[PDB]
Amino acid sequence: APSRNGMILKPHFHKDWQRRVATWFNQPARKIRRRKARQARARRIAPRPAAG
Amino acid sequence: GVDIRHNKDRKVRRKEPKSQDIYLRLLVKLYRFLARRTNSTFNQVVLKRLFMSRTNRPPLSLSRMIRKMKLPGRENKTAVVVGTVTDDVRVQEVPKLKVCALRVTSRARSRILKAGGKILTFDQLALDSPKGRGTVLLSGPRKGREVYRHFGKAPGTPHSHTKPYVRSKGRKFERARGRRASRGYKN
Amino acid sequence: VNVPKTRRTFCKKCGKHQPHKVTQYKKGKDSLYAQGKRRYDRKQSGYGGQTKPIFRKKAKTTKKIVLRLECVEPNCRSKRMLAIKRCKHFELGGDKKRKGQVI
Amino acid sequence: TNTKGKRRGTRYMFSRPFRKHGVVPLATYMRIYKKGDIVDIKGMGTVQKGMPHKCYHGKTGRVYNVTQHAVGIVVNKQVKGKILAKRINVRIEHIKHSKSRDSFLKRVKENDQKKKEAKEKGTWVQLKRQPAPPREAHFVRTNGKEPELLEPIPYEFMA
RNA sequence: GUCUACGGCCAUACCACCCUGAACGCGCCCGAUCUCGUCUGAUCUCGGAAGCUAAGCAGGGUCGGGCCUGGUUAGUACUUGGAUGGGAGACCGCCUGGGAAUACCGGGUGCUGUAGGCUU
RNA sequence: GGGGAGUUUGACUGGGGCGGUACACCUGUCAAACGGUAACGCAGGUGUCCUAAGGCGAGCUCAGGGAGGACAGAAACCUCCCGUGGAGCAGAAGGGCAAAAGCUCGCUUGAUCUUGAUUUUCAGUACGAAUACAGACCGUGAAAGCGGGGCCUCACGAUCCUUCUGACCUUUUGGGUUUUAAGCAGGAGGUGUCAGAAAAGUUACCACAGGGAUAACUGGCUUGUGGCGGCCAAGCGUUCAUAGCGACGUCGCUUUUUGAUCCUUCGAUGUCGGCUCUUCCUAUCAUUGUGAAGCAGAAUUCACCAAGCGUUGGAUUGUUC
RNA sequence: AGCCGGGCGUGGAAUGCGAGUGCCUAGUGGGCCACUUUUGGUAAGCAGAACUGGCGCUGCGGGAUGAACCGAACGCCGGGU
RNA sequence: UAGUAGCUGGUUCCCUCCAAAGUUUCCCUCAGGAUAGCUGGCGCUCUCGCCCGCAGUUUUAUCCGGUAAAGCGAAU
RNA sequence: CUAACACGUGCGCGAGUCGGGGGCUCGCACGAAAGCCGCCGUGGCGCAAUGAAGGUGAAGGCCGGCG
Numbered sequence A: 001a002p003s004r005n006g007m008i009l010k011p012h013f014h015k016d017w018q019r020r021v022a023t024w025f026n027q028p029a030r031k032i033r034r035r036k037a038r039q040a041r042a043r044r045i046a047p048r049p050a051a052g
Numbered sequence B: 001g002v003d004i005r006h007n008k009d010r011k012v013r014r015k016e017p018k019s020q021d022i023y024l025r026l027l028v029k030l031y032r033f034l035a036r037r038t039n040s041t042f043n044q045v046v047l048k049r050l051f052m053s054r055t056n057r058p059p060l061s062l063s064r065m066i067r068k069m070k071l072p073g074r075e076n077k078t079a080v081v082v083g084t085v086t087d088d089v090r091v092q093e094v095p096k097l098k099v100c101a102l103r104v105t106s107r108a109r110s111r112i113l114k115a116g117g118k119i120l121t122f123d124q125l126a127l128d129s130p131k132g133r134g135t136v137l138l139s140g141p142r143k144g145r146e147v148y149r150h151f152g153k154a155p156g157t158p159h160s161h162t163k164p165y166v167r168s169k170g171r172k173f174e175r176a177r178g179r180r181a182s183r184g185y186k187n
Numbered sequence C: 001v002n003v004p005k006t007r008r009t010f011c012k013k014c015g016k017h018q019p020h021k022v023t024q025y026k027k028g029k030d031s032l033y034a035q036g037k038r039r040y041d042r043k044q045s046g047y048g049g050q051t052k053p054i055f056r057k058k059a060k061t062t063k064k065i066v067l068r069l070e071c072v073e074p075n076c077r078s079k080r081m082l083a084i085k086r087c088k089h090f091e092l093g094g095d096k097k098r099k100g101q102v103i
Numbered sequence D: 001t002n003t004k005g006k007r008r009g010t011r012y013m014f015s016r017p018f019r020k021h022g023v024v025p026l027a028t029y030m031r032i033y034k035k036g037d038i039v040d041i042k043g044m045g046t047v048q049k050g051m052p053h054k055c056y057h058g059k060t061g062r063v064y065n066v067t068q069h070a071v072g073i074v075v076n077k078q079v080k081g082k083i084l085a086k087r088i089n090v091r092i093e094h095i096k097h098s099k100s101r102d103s104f105l106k107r108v109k110e111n112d113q114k115k116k117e118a119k120e121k122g123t124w125v126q127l128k129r130q131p132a133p134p135r136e137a138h139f140v141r142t143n144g145k146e147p148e149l150l151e152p153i154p155y156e157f158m159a
Numbered sequence E: 001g002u003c004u005a006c007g008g009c010c011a012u013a014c015c016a017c018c019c020u021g022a023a024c025g026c027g028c029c030c031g032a033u034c035u036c037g038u039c040u041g042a043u044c045u046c047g048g049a050a051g052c053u054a055a056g057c058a059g060g061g062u063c064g065g066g067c068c069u070g071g072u073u074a075g076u077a078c079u080u081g082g083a084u085g086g087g088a089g090a091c092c093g094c095c096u097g098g099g100a101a102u103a104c105c106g107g108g109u110g111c112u113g114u115a116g117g118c119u120u
Numbered sequence F: 001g002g003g004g005a006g007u008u009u010g011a012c013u014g015g016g017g018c019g020g021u022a023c024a025c026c027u028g029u030c031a032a033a034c035g036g037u038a039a040c041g042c043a044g045g046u047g048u049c050c051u052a053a054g055g056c057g058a059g060c061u062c063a064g065g066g067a068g069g070a071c072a073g074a075a076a077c078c079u080c081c082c083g084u085g086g087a088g089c090a091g092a093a094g095g096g097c098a099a100a101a102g103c104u105c106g107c108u109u110g111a112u113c114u115u116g117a118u119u120u121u122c123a124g125u126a127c128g129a130a131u132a133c134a135g136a137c138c139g140u141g142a143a144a145g146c147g148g149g150g151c152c153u154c155a156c157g158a159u160c161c162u163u164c165u166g167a168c169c170u171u172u173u174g175g176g177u178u179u180u181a182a183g184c185a186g187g188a189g190g191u192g193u194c195a196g197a198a199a200a201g202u203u204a205c206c207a208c209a210g211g212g213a214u215a216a217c218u219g220g221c222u223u224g225u226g227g228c229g230g231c232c233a234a235g236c237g238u239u240c241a242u243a244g245c246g247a248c249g250u251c252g253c254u255u256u257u258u259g260a261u262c263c264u265u266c267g268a269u270g271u272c273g274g275c276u277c278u279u280c281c282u283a284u285c286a287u288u289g290u291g292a293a294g295c296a297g298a299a300u301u302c303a304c305c306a307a308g309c310g311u312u313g314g315a316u317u318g319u320u321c
Numbered sequence G: 001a002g003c004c005g006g007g008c009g010u011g012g013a014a015u016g017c018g019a020g021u022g023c024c025u026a027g028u029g030g031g032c033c034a035c036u037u038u039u040g041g042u043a044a045g046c047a048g049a050a051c052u053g054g055c056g057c058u059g060c061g062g063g064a065u066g067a068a069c070c071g072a073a074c075g076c077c078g079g080g081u
Numbered sequence H: 001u002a003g004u005a006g007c008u009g010g011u012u013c014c015c016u017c018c019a020a021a022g023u024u025u026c027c028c029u030c031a032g033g034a035u036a037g038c039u040g041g042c043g044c045u046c047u048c049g050c051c052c053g054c055a056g057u058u059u060u061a062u063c064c065g066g067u068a069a070a071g072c073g074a075a076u
Numbered sequence I: 001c002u003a004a005c006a007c008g009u010g011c012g013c014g015a016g017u018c019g020g021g022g023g024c025u026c027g028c029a030c031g032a033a034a035g036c037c038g039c040c041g042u043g044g045c046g047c048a049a050u051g052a053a054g055g056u057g058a059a060g061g062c063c064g065g066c067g
């Protein structure tokens, strides 16, 4: 029920949103893995540009 | 039994800053002493404004300060503001001023120093003028915050130019029934 | 009520009082391709039965009838809608009544 | 509950006084109201145009706008726990200059005059209206006739 | 003393009957070509000046009606506030303040503004 | 197309239901001399009507009564006099109105286009209704003026959708033309449960969450109704108001009748009778002791102290009766 | 009517008292009783209103007892009334 | 599926200060909500140690009313 | 507890502000932390509103030159 004054809100939480939740606790590990793969490819292509 | 009411018995004004930093509290000590051992009320006003909160110490712009100090009679006096002096970019000519403030923007300080004025802090202000003679006490626009556009007489009510709380501005958001004579009524 | 077939009244296009021929406004035939109608058949088509409400609790026995005015000036011939209060029986320019006759 | 009609319960308030029906005397029409006069409201049922609502009958307001036939006046109305100073338009028949202000105006002129006078004389004069003071001491002279006795009369039934 | 034109307050000015009106005025009054309108020049409109205060109108009168203003009714009726007052109740008394209205008995019977006359 | 599916089956409310609408409005009263103020309080009205019954101007005065005039009369038409409204103004009521707001004529369409402000219910929001203006086009009158509906107080309707009207109007999405469609502004078509859902029943086969906010027992307050008792004394009693009664009145008592209410109890106080058994009340049927009779005796009445002791056996009916 | 400029302070009744203003906001939206006024009802510890004060939210002295009556409202104690 | 419940029941330490409402309007609204009202908290702008204002009060002026009473030799 | 919003408070910077995503740092006890990027500010919020839309889009006041 509306209080005295405020904004009308439409939260999009009428589905089973708690089953599909993407936590980001693997973000630093993902960054580390991407780095390691990047340096591995850079070593693999010996004199070639690393960027491509 | 005494026929009295205790509703407004306790006054709500601030006795001390809610902040916890030490520099402001040292300033408060100094100006407490000055206010209670000097008859000048400038010290009392400055101490009271030191007590106040951030939203009650709005920033003062360079254009406002030069505009209020260019008035006749108040030449070569020190402009005292308890807030923050922010730079105004839509002003080219800046004179030499004697400013005192708690904190000054880097660009504003550069502008004043280049123009030739000097920046003072409330400590050195105490040394220069304990009772504060030759001071022009200014303040920023307190009603400048945008929250004040939502206050007052409610919208959707005749002769009320109050901003509603809308999540997005557009033609589909609060424009149909109470805002048009074509659809229902117009307030 | 009785209303004459001619009325000298203001004309928006002419910007002055002009004679007007008046008739009774009747509702036009509902176009099949209005946006509301198209949305209505799009929603009704398929399964689920009736979707929008059907009004049934009629209560009023009369309705405000509208006079369609037309400026008699051939160059202008603009038209305007004019409505007056409700009436059960209504006629246009019939048997202008006279007083003090035999009942 | 009751009815919200605009003229409910006004059969005596908007009626005319006894043996005073008929043509409105023209002096009411021939009075001048300017901006800022204190004026009284008294609804007159003889004319129905511009009749004030019954809740302003007997109220005193201030004129803020003058128009061909009517006058706009600001008057206070007590609504629940608050008073609103609202402005209403009343035709000139239902209105009448308030004499509560002219007494104060005349007093102002008179004490200003007596202040201007005696200023050169240096004497003291009282201007504030003091409340009725207690009676001072005096002598009541009997003229040789002694006051007569007063006694209650005996009960004896009338009806 | 007073009238006419326009009024203000709208009976202290109205209503009924009776008496008196110098001068001006207001009227009644005499006619229907024109203006105008009617069944009818009765009304209205128009053109006049033989006669008259008869009437209107003005002033006055009535142990007049009414109206206006006082006394009486009356500190009665009613009523703000108070009591661990009375009474089975209905109601009543007191304290603190305010305070009416008929019947009945007196007095009065238009004031006045602007302009213009008459009383040479 | 109830074979089957989903769903609904208003509210108010001296329990609910039936009844009614007090559910949207208006008049008088309640209402306690500002305003506001309740009940299924009282008396009533509305969902319309009007090309004039709107707007001006002019001229007349109504209801009723008295006195007269061929048919003519109680009432047909004409004349005079009186006539403060006792008539009329569409409707309920109230207010208002006399060279008018009434009656009769003349001319008209201010019932027209448009932006704002204000009042009424009010939250001081809408709708509805209304009030002063202002800007154009007009009507009427010689004119001053008056008029943007009805003398005032009531006669009415959001969003979404549809329909009509308006502009050398905007968009119709890569550009251009034309149909079409969508916009902008103003009306209409509703929601009367009238601030506006699209809606039939039954359940004793029933279920759940609750409710003593609410019914069906008792118990409380009340006592109309029931029952019982007084005072007055018209009359009855052959004569005699009061041996015994007692009209027309009027004052009470009781809670063994019924009502009225809804205070307790709905996480339950086992809801008719009969059988059995005890105790209590007296408003006494009998017995003990008395007083009065229209008490000769017998029998029988009325009254007093008085509840100690008794107040049965059966047919019919579940019965209380 | 609005503008400017100028002159007037015995601050023009009594009494009392600092005042104005802005945000955010919980609970509540079953009430009951009493003097007086008052509607329905035969009446009711009934039903319905107006004003004020109470109870609810409140203990204390008195009315033996008691939500509302009379007195009086409350920190822990001594004395007095 | 820990389905929904305007409906019952429960809802855990101390002291200090302030302190209510059962009323208005709308709602298929009447055991509930929204909105005013009543509350608290946070402040802020000034003020006195000549003067400003305000008031559940009085006084002096000035208007407003149709109840109590009274009247029917006044209207209905 | 998460998300959104409103308001009040504390801190930094301030017409700007914010690396949250990514990358560079010999990856790695703590460390999945911390530091840095500035030609990684893309971008968000703010700095301009109004209109349905086509669109438009935020002072002026005095003297000399033909009251």
Ligand SMILES: [Mg+2]
Residues within 6 Å of the ligand: none
């Ligand atoms: Mg809430």
Ligand SMILES: [Mg+2]
Residues within 6 Å of the ligand: B001
């Ligand atoms: Mg104390």
Ligand SMILES: [Mg+2]
Residues within 6 Å of the ligand: B007, B008, H018
């Ligand atoms: Mg407080």
Ligand SMILES: [Mg+2]
Residues within 6 Å of the ligand: C045, C046
């Ligand atoms: Mg199909």
Ligand SMILES: [Mg+2]
Residues within 6 Å of the ligand: E041
């Ligand atoms: Mg003649």
Ligand SMILES: [Mg+2]
Residues within 6 Å of the ligand: E053, E055
């Ligand atoms: Mg004469």
Ligand SMILES: [Mg+2]
Residues within 6 Å of the ligand: none
């Ligand atoms: Mg004569």
Ligand SMILES: [Mg+2]
Residues within 6 Å of the ligand: none
């Ligand atoms: Mg007389």
Ligand SMILES: [Mg+2]
Residues within 6 Å of the ligand: none
């Ligand atoms: Mg004269």
Ligand SMILES: [Mg+2]
Residues within 6 Å of the ligand: none
């Ligand atoms: Mg002579």
Ligand SMILES: [Mg+2]
Residues within 6 Å of the ligand: none
């Ligand atoms: Mg079925």
Ligand SMILES: [Mg+2]
Residues within 6 Å of the ligand: none
């Ligand atoms: Mg009153």
Ligand SMILES: [Mg+2]
Residues within 6 Å of the ligand: none
């Ligand atoms: Mg006329």
Ligand SMILES: [Mg+2]
Residues within 6 Å of the ligand: none
């Ligand atoms: Mg006009």
Ligand SMILES: [Mg+2]
Residues within 6 Å of the ligand: none
């Ligand atoms: Mg009419």
Ligand SMILES: [Mg+2]
Residues within 6 Å of the ligand: F204
């Ligand atoms: Mg069966």
